[PDB]
Subunit: 295 residues, 4 copies
């Protein structure tokens, strides 16, 4: 037998950082969950019980805190790139670092119409994520995403004209509820190293904001022919607005809401044009994916 | 042996309702999870296999959908009271109904600065809940609550002057992070029946809004001596603003964020006044409760 | 306003303890999650910011570890009683302690047909729990339970003869699947104090074992007329076998498995006597409760 | 823009099947959660709103139930291969099917030392899984796994001799607790089609049993130098026992249990050789992965 692939590190490292403006008294908080996995010349830890090649996962944890102390943690694309680069530069035998960051929302409270200097609310479990792969001699690959963005529209969704055969019971419809949890990922062109990532810092927050805005507007305004058609429109627009993105991937559940026929009860009308009360279905769910790139 | 207490019914009934304004084209959605448990002269179903006394839980489910079709589902205090009353009026041998409703957020989207007519976002997993106990000959008892409101302040929280003995290691502090998930419940005076609940309909949404506003403002503005002292200030204000409330109960976890001593690493200063990076603790957590009533 | 009720403490305290037999080399592990909430003369911490009356929740945490170091942690009824008594004896102004313990399964591995001395497996998320209320001058009240015991029988369950009216669509059945997650609680007679709890130590594990055995056997062997009738048979037997129990409470979801009509597809027969493939329903679910006591 | 990749289908399809032996009266149940995603000539559903190429996800759901009605559902490797093959054979424009199956445990109850004919218990949330990729013209690729197998050993684990630098605080140890949740995957050699999968049917259950047995025995008996070294020993043995496996992958969290220094309290000794009470850590956790193949 031989080791074909190996990686190891620390997962689920929760980190909070506060920035305090001495002039204004305004404080800003960041909270993330971080995972770092390393690869390199470590096969002998598996095959020969040679621990000398192991940077202990506990040390990886310490390194995350130290790096957060000495560097900006925003945008997460930058922090992830700093953190990954550290490991390949510090340890001769480590040749790749894989950094995943999940950013949790702490949104400044408005109290009596004014932004509060040091109080925050978790407005939704929507996350902003990054995956950063730092590979020695191959640069820095960054995938940015938003996830857990849950939306619903109560009309202006259709689904007709699909294949009908002996396995089909679904009725065509020209008016249905459409609800999903949005997972959207944009992959940046490969960066040569940290200097290049630094050069593009302003683009990271702006592209996240654009991706979110395009997602919401397209969902709200499209008279949707299918999840497939609406998601493609989203991806097309993001690629048009940021030339440094190579691909956009969407993964969308179709969270079904079923009509309830109540006609058995005193002829009550609750289907089609008369439908008011529906039964949300926890499972199963459609799952629709697509990756869109450039011609 | 004897049956000392019994209740049964249907839990986890998901319900969605849409309201469509024909004039404006504006649609409004409501989504809830409902539980209904019944009590009454049903002992023989347990002791003698006498199913004749059982309103099937499946029928309870149907009743929830039918009731939602024929009645307003908002405010939930009203819907719960209608639903509970139905069972005690319809079935001679049923003498109490216990209705729990959890309301999920579907907040209208703003697209380009204007409210969208039929598109919604789940902005946080904060819930608005009601528990309604309808007891034949004893009226309607309603407990309203908000839950899952997660907040954090990065300063203006203190904790000193507590009991110190041989079990104590905690250091006194004049500046710490305070974070919690708010669970707040206000109990209404007993209502004589549905007519009285209807008479107070406007008070339900207004009191929820007040409870939420008082919670947020007090949390943000109090230079907190402890969770105990801050929560009492919240409860006091709610009772002052709504005379039909008899008690207010808060249940608050103290979600700890620990300083990380980094001085072992090149004398890095990250404690006390120099603290920037902290470790959020998933467990354990303080849990502080209080019920406040009138003199 | 006035404080009507207050309690506070530490939740979610994870504790592991190992016992090592020097003679045999056999090791035995216990893992629990503990919550302790205190009541007493603490109103002024809420109303006056008087922290002098507060035993810090951090100190409660330390006390749990110290108590586990110096005492047996099994049976949990005993450990809970020791822990609760500590607080009322140590602190003059604390008058009640409420201790909840959840015990996690670590079952010794059998390797090649022999019990391993120090290796364990988590065989299911079934828990053994205790709630212990130690109230000064009123003794020790203990509720023991098992929870998360998930079972299914594929036949020998019936449900017919229930009330039928204009809200009823459920068909009567003489053969259905019955599946539930068992939550069973037995409440002990009040104990005068720790000496009396110690005197009954052997009864605690034996009664848990009996409760579990009666639950499983009755479920498997009863040709069930309803969840109500089967659960009553369980409770009756437990009360018969342990005279120091005052009441038994069961809370049982009815986890539905629906027939799937496939007759639309080439006349495939999958209902009634021909039913082979079913659709488990995640929600909604029936919920059936009963508390059984002595004549 | 262009569609670079696309797949769609139905997720979270819960399925139960019962087998009834008419001769013996013995019943056997299977419960699974199934996901099926399709690929093929479907780009126009995304780019042109052409639904004619879409096999509706609802129809995929129906197909899963029909296929389960007409075929064995065990071993899951076979069922997955039947299900995947169906889609590529039935639909000209569908060229790949991706089938994921999670099998839930329903273990026959022993009542009074005898196996019960129709009563079952969920003994742990351990799963047996398969991923089957059926690709037209490229055969059938099957990855089998077990997951959610949670184990702990209280001694006979060591970790010393790792890299020490200015980021290291971890002390070397010759005796620690080791606990993990095992995720183990074995990848079969590519099969040419369904006939070949059928020819190897007996190997599937046998290899699962072997993988589980090797995992448990190795964990229990290895005086472990690290998670890395122990997991490699596991993978080596599985590859030795089944020649039709090409690779074995393990992914193991290191679930930490920390010593608690109690010496501040009356000199209580609870570290090193005196350690009895530990604090299980929910997060962070080490994460160690390896893929082992043949020389
Ligand atoms: O078994 C281990 N492997 C590791 O890589 C490691 N790092 N810290 N502790 C550890 N334990
Ligand atoms: O066992 C049952 N008890 C009930 O009360 C019920 N209601 N619907 N189905 C049921 N099954
Ligand atoms: O606000 C607090 N209240 C308490 O009771 C406590 N105990 N430890 N820390 C604490 N903080
Ligand atoms: O938008 C949809 N896309 C699909 O592929 C599908 N299949 N069933 N319903 C559906 N809705
Ligand atoms: Na390197
Ligand atoms: Na009545
Ligand atoms: Na006392
Ligand atoms: Na094909």
């Amino acid at each position: 037998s031989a080791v074909k692939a190996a990686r190891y590190g620390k997962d689920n490292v929760r980190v909070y950082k506060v920035h305090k403006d001495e002039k204004t008294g305004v404080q800003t908080v960041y909270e993330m969950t971080v995972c770092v996995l390393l690869e390199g010349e470590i096969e002998t830890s598996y095959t020969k019980a040679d621990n000398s090649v192991i940077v202990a996962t506990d040390s990886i944890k310490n390194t995350i805190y130290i790096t957060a102390k000495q560097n900006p943690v925003t945008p997460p694309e930058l922090f992830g790139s700093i953190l990954g680069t550290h490991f390949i530069e510090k340890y001769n035998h480590i040749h790749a670092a894989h950094v995943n960051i999940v950013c949790h929302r702490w949104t400044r409270m408005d109290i009596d119409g004014k932004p509060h200097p040091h109080s925050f609310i978790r407005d939704s479990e929507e996350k902003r994520n990054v995956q950063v792969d730092v590979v020695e001699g191959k640069g820095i690959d960054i995938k940015s995403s938003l996830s857990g963005l849950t939306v619903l529209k109560s009309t202006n969704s259709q689904f007709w004209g699909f294949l009908r055969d002996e396995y089909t019971t679904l009725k065509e419809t020209w008016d249905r509820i459409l609800s999903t949890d949005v997972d959207a990922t944009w992959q940046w062109k490969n960066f040569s190293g940290l200097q290049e990532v630094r050069s593009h810092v302003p683009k990271f927050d702006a592209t996240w904001a654009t991706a979110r805005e395009v997602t919401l507007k397209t969902f709200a305004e499209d008279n949707s022919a299918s999840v497939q058609a609406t998601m493609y429109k989203m991806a097309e627009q993001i690629l048009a607005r940021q030339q440094l993105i190579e691909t956009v991937e969407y993964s969308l559940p179709n969270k079904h809401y079923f009509e309830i026929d109540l006609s058995w009860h005193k002829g009550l009308q609750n289907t089609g044009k008369n439908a008011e009360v529906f039964a949300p279905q926890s499972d199963p769910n459609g799952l629709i994916k697509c990756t869109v790139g450039r011609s």
